[PDB]
Amino acid sequence: LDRADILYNIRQTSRPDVIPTQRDRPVAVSVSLKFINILEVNEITNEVDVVFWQQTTWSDRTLAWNSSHSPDQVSVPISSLWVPDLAAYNAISKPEVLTPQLARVVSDGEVLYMPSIRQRFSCDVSGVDTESGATCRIKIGSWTHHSREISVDPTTENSDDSEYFSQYSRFEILDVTQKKNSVTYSCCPEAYEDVEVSLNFRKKG
Amino acid sequence: LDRADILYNIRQTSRPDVIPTQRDRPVAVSVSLKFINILEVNEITNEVDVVFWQQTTWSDRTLAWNSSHSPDQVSVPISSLWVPDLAAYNAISKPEVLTPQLARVVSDGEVLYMPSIRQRFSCDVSGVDTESGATCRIKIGSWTHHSREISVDPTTENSDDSEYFSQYSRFEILDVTQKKNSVTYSCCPEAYEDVEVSLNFRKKG
């Protein structure tokens, strides 16, 4: 199999509109926001404008192929793939995707998509000009799927983000935490999952 | 063969979603930014807003045709072609393409695409009002492909861009340098490439 064959096979099997659950197990989606920049901050309106890489991975076993004597990965446009319907519940702008909309698909059926996204959030911005800094909280989850269809699994739960964040921003990152939260309501048997991202940052001295 | 035939043959042969590697050699891509204007600069936020022609070339041998008694080049909409997934890693806005999205395809299979692009970057803006000027670095590479699938190379390397740059800008270009970086990480056998464009510029007196 060459790359053309693999891509042909993926186009034949992949259903962009069909969540790839296997036997009613949830699709485990791993998600980690890597902050690149904080562009604009307003302490009066409590709004922040940020750029981050949204590292997202999951598995679609139907995409798998035998990779002895074949490439073990290819780049595939996301319009040919199912992607999780993730959204930030406190976003006040559409996510602007800055980058080419290509995922990486591994021969075992793993999908890796890491778009660079610019987006505005309504956030606690107080203390941004102090030493402790501001702590801006972003809640991310599936817009339509509960925990028996999609699980959201934060990776890199604690980091200073030093490897990603622009040295040229007027802000510096003190700490980023990404934590899983699941609620069960008395009305309804299933659980609801999200990642709470806490971005603790301040204006540079 | 007339232009209609060539375009039909290209549509039959080209797979826009399939990297045209030949025998598992990388697709050699050349990229060179030609600056046309610097529109807005902010020394406080370290942001610049620029217009440039992104001269990009590569080869897809499957597009080739016999050009005795035929046109040896045609203009082709890029939606019929594979294009490299290049991105500027420190971009903070989507690339706004200002021009018709047509590439030039030569009968030997060379493709030349040179969109005029407006885009904002986070970069070092300090010294913009001095004689030495600011030096704003833009890193461009493939979003998903390593160097055995796509290689990215500069062309010129050193230029004042006097042939391209608007005489009506508030800024003047002192120097533009375009250099290849290749990194190999301990974890991973393949190399990761980018082109670093260093735009040395200052406010006119």
Partner: peptide, 17 residues
């Protein structure tokens, strides 16, 4: 390292994320 280069990241699941 690898994980802060976008292509290296997605090419190396076992290393990144």
């Amino acid at each position: 390292g690898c994980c802060s280069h976008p292509a290296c990241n997605v090419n190396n699941p076992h290393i990144c994320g």
